[PDB]
Amino acid sequence: EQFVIFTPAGNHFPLVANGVPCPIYIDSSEDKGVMIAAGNLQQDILQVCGKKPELLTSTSSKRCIIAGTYGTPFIKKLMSAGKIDKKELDGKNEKYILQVIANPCEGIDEAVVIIGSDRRGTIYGIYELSEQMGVSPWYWWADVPVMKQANVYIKPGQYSDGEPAVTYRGIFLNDEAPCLTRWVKHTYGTNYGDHRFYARVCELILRLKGNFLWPAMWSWAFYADDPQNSKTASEMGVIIGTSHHEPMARNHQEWSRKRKEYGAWDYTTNQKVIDQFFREGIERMQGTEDIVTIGMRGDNVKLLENVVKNQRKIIEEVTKRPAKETPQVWALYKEVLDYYDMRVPDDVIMLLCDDNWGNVCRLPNAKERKHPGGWGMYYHVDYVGAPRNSKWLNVTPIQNMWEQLQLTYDYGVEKLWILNVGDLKPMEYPITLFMDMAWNPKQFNVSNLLDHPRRFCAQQFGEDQADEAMRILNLYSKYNGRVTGEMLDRNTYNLETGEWKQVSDEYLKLEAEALRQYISLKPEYKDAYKQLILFPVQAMANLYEMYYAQAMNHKLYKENNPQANEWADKVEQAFARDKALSDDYNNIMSGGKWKNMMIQKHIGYTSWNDNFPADTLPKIYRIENPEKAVGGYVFTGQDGYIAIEAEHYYSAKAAPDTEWTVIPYMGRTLSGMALMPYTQPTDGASISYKIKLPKGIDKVTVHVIVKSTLAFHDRKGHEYSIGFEGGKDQTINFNHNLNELPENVYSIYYPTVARRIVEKKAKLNVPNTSDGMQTITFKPLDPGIVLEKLVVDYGGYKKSYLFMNESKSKR
Amino acid sequence: QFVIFTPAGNHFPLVANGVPCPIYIDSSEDKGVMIAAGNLQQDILQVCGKKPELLTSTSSKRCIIAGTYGTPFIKKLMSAGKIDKKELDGKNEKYILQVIANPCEGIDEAVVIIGSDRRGTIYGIYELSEQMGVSPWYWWADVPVMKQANVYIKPGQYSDGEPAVTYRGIFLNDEAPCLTRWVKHTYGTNYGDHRFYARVCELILRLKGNFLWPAMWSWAFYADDPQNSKTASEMGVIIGTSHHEPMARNHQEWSRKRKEYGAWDYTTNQKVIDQFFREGIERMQGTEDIVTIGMRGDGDAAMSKSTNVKLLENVVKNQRKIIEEVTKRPAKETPQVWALYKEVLDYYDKGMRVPDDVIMLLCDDNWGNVCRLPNAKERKHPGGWGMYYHVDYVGAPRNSKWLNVTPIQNMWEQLQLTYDYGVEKLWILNVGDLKPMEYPITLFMDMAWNPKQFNVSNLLDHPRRFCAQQFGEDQADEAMRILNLYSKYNGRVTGEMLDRNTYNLETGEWKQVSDEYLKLEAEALRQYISLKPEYKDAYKQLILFPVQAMANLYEMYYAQAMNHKLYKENNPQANEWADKVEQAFARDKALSDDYNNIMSGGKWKNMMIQKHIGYTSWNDNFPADTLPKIYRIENPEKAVGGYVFTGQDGYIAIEAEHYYSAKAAPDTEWTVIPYMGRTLSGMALMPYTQPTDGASISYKIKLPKGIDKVTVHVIVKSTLAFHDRKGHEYSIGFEGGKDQTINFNHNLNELPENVYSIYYPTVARRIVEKKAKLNVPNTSDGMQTITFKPLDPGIVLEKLVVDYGGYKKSYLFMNESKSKRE
Ligand code: NA
Ligand code: NA
């Protein structure tokens, strides 16, 4: 299926040789659609080789590219002379055959020859040649650059994508304010989508091998905003439709814009105007391949069957042809689905719908499977509705989309697949997976699934970047699948179990890995990578840290712990950084080409809809007078252990001329506590910790971690006592053996001081307090002792380099 | 702070819109001051873009004047007023910077720097440069000089006072392979010539130090190039030698002539040694150099065997006699040092003493902790005390040659101590190859100057001022946060000592520390890409690389630990972790390759080539960085099923892929969908166009024998009632007991009762959780088998949680429980 090589070879056609492209010939009996594709091919080749190939007016070159459509007299007298059999394109749908051939017609020696089964086959073939040459369908829509080549050669043999398994394959631009609309404003100057915009949309669709579009309908009217809209799609080869709730080829806004004049949307009071409304739409779309939405809602099963009948009679009257000859779609959404369980005319495409969240609701049984008109599926990657919007980023696991669409195809649904793509961006990858599956759902299985994004990343970022990029794409997709950014908040994950820490840290790890890849990019890929990997990863990693930080702020605040203050700072930074990321995306990235494409509000949802005016700061509490909020900690032992950071003491008594001092960051974990200054004696000085232990425990082992200070004042060493109030003390010398004497030097000395701490264990007795509360007092007996951590082991301590996670506390 | 970058009245014009102003040094000044001024000239050039003139005589309107207290010219400036002699007379290494009107004949107004001695004057000149934007680290760390249109000098008198420590210096040590091979590449010499030593010296004086122990592993400072001493001496730097290099001879001077000489044994070869000693003192005449007395044993070792206090006394008594013979003066007039390093401390303990005048150099443990400090009586020892501090070390229990590993807090907490106990004559820090200890050096030198500038409360303002100076005000706070934290992390354990067993794997501590460093990396990359391009090189040198190299090194070892744990269980997931080791190994090389070859244009090739992966013992005596041992499961795709879970903490969380046994229905397969769901993957019977009748999937677990009842949570993909109005059903149960059926999606539709209470809430989250209570059968095994049976097509099973009292509502349904397979 790969027919382009970038190095010369025998019995291969020199399309581009040593920087010189052969010309292009399109016979003039070819639809305007082919001439466009061919003009784009011409520019695509200019992109790859540097020199513009000439669009021939006649058969005036020895080697060239020819592209044509089956059924032409010219193509017939080429297929005939010769070799290419008729059966291979006769009555085939949207197929092409691409084949190097001598000697195609008199004035020519040899040519690469693309022949379509119909115009879209021919267009699809042209773009295949263009894509295998390195022009990604996303060269404009995602700034993917064109890998330059001095030599392009085409393999011998016959090359096809066959027939598309799904008859109509398209996208729906929807939920398009404010992002898409304000982008279109910035780019085109228009308060609607005009033909310049839709040319861009149609080309993407076609280059993706797609063939269908539901144009934007929230505030615009495709048919009525610009006479050239229809003319543009129809001449290029894109079939227009309208959404399930816009019957008879009228755009919903055509009615709304004139609500006051036309009156109610109700068939039992305003039938005549509505019939005329329907009628004018069917007239407007004559001579396009457009598909017609039937049915009606709002403002009995009998009433509806009668609307359809009338709609069909209106179709018959305008077309002067039986209804069955106008493509029609009827949607099974809401009540109309219940009704179905209802007389539906044989020829109509019956359109099923997903649950708005990527899971299919209902599929046809074997009896329904043989409904002549076929079945369609309406699938979502964006959504405005319950339980909360998903308007912001891509939230679709590659696996989900895959799993539900192979199911859909397998249950016979193969007439029409339409994907709600929001603002188009940032759904570039899921769009592509949708089109490729729509072409052939049986080209995929569990084994090879991830090859598709691998190809995608190879195509978007060069082969050397493909694997790493694909890994990041697949993961970020999966992470975003867990919870949308709109429904993410401080409660989504479990703080207590370290779940929230694990998912925050993991997303930041991915951010790290995406930045590695990003700075390793040849600069002409930086934009496409930011758009398709870097930004979604950065934006959501940052969001996750924000709510993580919000969660920590609340837990800590309720614990009267002033560490809440730092977590508040963090919330504010992430909130700032969120706006910072999108400003880069709108104004800086790609020269600000995509201004307004990333302005969707997502922080401040207290509801299903984005009712709130702007992105707003998530509630944070600050502890007043942190400097003075020290001491008072009480720990609650759990899982057989109490890990305590020196600083979280209950009460403390200093020696005269000393102040117990917090040395932040000191040691392996939180901080160090030390009597200061070091010149004064430590007599009478103590520091205490309040804990709850299960009652009955009478003997515990306590680990005391101190900075590995050496015997600097006195050859004996440093000593301290550790003990329970109401129990016997133990006095420990921790550094007497820590010196260069032969029996200490490599046995105990250096192995200790390299690792900067001294840990000693004490087997202490615990008094029988009736409420389980205990107080452990530590007394430094010599100067310059820095206490870092205590661990009360009562059966659960597990030897850990940082001496286990700090236990539950409050002040 | 006296330098502003915008004009104003009553201020002094130093740079007007790209125009500097001349400098004038009276030719009566030490050559070292001409050198400093020489550099100031080049600094201004860098600041605006035009080089100021070095005036022959006092002949200008607006110029800089620098000088030293005592010259006839200076006295005839200070009297021209209004400056008191007391301010500088008898003062040590102090300066006065005061704009003065009508300073002498020919000069209208001039910025005047007057030092109390030559070094004073120099530090004054370098204070001007530093304040103008010339960072001491402008060459040594590629720190840009912020371009300035205008530059002006506030009025009033300015000083740093006298320094609190007399001698403040560095020891270049453990200098191979990095420093050595870099010097080669840079200077073209296989030894340190005066050109290398000029750069070293300049840095020291700019940092406000004054002392140096030169590299001595394979070089000989004094012999290699006759200009070495002359440069240091003439620039203002005082030279000394290490604790095993007595009497002004570099140890290699002995090694090079070892056969010719005798053997480093004073009791049997006194004559040849006495002469060696003598030649050193002869040679350092005319210099401020400090002389090492005492004697260890021929390298980093003891003379000899065990403490011999009587003998070393003769060594000393004799050395001091040589000093007088050479100097024809009393010994007490030649600066001397006795260093109590390693074993030499038992000497002082066994009671050895030296004359009142020698500097008693006390020592840290080679790892940042001070060994001893004077008591009350001892602090009264007239020669004074000193401290030999380490930020790099070759020796026990393993080398630390690679990266900065000193937490900011440690250096500070130990040095505030040292100072409080009146150790205030000499501080020297072992800096390894100088790079990458740029930070700790500066903290050392700044503390050295003025230790009571620092307290626990404002400590962190020092690396802040550091980062501002190096990266620009707007990146200070963040850069400082990263500097502090990375220093701290590295304190936990050295690169050399870190290995797969450092952290606890089972508890998730390993995971924790690995993620935290990549978080840090992530944060530093952010800051990096946000920088104006002139700072990129510095920031890489000072922050980025230390962080990346280490974060990567932590991940390599974490992956190793995960690889072995998983390989033990026969879990093919071990292959992924294996790939991850090889990948981070390669990345370690890529990072140092960049540092050596790409960054700063390759200015620092070989400064970052230390071996750090593959230490078996204390020393780096192994061929090269070598890949940690990893294990692979052969035939991974066939290594499925067989899993047995063991409960803990009152739960068993099973990822669905990890089954014990399965049986498919006719013309279906049980199929793994990697990444499917919230966690690991999903199991589904495929294709979905077949009935699931007779299909099942089983899990083998170990509960405590006395658990009668459990609640199992079954998590499937939120598949909807697509085929059958009744919806989808499965059953879950123990072999030996009854199956329990569950209909998971009947309530998931648009009916009024369901639509907004349960339907949309559930589907937007892509999963369905249902719980069943189960009776635990009594088994002979103590083991139970729990069987899931899909009853409708298209059910994807994601996870199971067997809960016997420990389960905690979690979005990901808790970290998977402990397993092994076969
Ligand atoms: Na959007
Ligand atoms: Na080194």
Numbering used by the authors:
A (entry chain B): 32 to 330, 340 to 381, 384 to 853
B (entry chain A): 33 to 854
Publication excerpt:
Inspection of the surface of the BoAgu115A protomers revealed a cleft-like structure in the (β/α)8 domain that extends over the central β-barrel, on the opposite surface to the N-terminal domain. The Oδ-2 of Asp-332 in the apo structure (the amino acid is not visible in the structure of the BoAgu115A-GlcA complex, discussed in detail below), is in an appropriate position to make polar contacts with O2 of GlcA, whereas Oδ-1 of Asp-206 forms a polar contact with O1 and may therefore act as the catalytic acid. It is evident, however, that the distance between Asp-332 and Glu-375 (in the apo structure) and the O1 of GlcA (in the structure of BoAgu115A in complex with GlcA); 5.4 Å and 11.8 Å, respectively, are greater than the normal ∼3.5 Å between the catalytic base and the anomeric carbon of the glycone sugar in inverting glycoside hydrolases. In enzymes and non-catalytic binding proteins that interact with glucuronic acid, arginines are often important specificity determinates, making bidentate hydrogen bonds/salt bridges with the carboxylate group. It is possible that in BoAgu115A Arg-328 contributes to substrate binding by also interacting with the carboxylate of the glucuronic acid substrate, a view supported by the observation that the R328A mutation caused ∼105-fold decrease in activity. Thus, for the arginine to contribute to substrate binding the loop containing this amino acid (and Asp-332) would be required to undergo a conformational change.
Here we show that a dominant member of the human microbiota, Bacteroides ovatus, contains a GH115 enzyme, BoAgu115A, which displays glucuronoxylan α-(4-O-methyl)-glucuronidase activity. The enzyme is significantly more active against substrates in which the xylose decorated with GlcA/MeGlcA is flanked by one or more xylose residues. The third domain, a five-helical bundle, and the C-terminal β-sandwich domain make inter-chain contacts leading to protein dimerization.
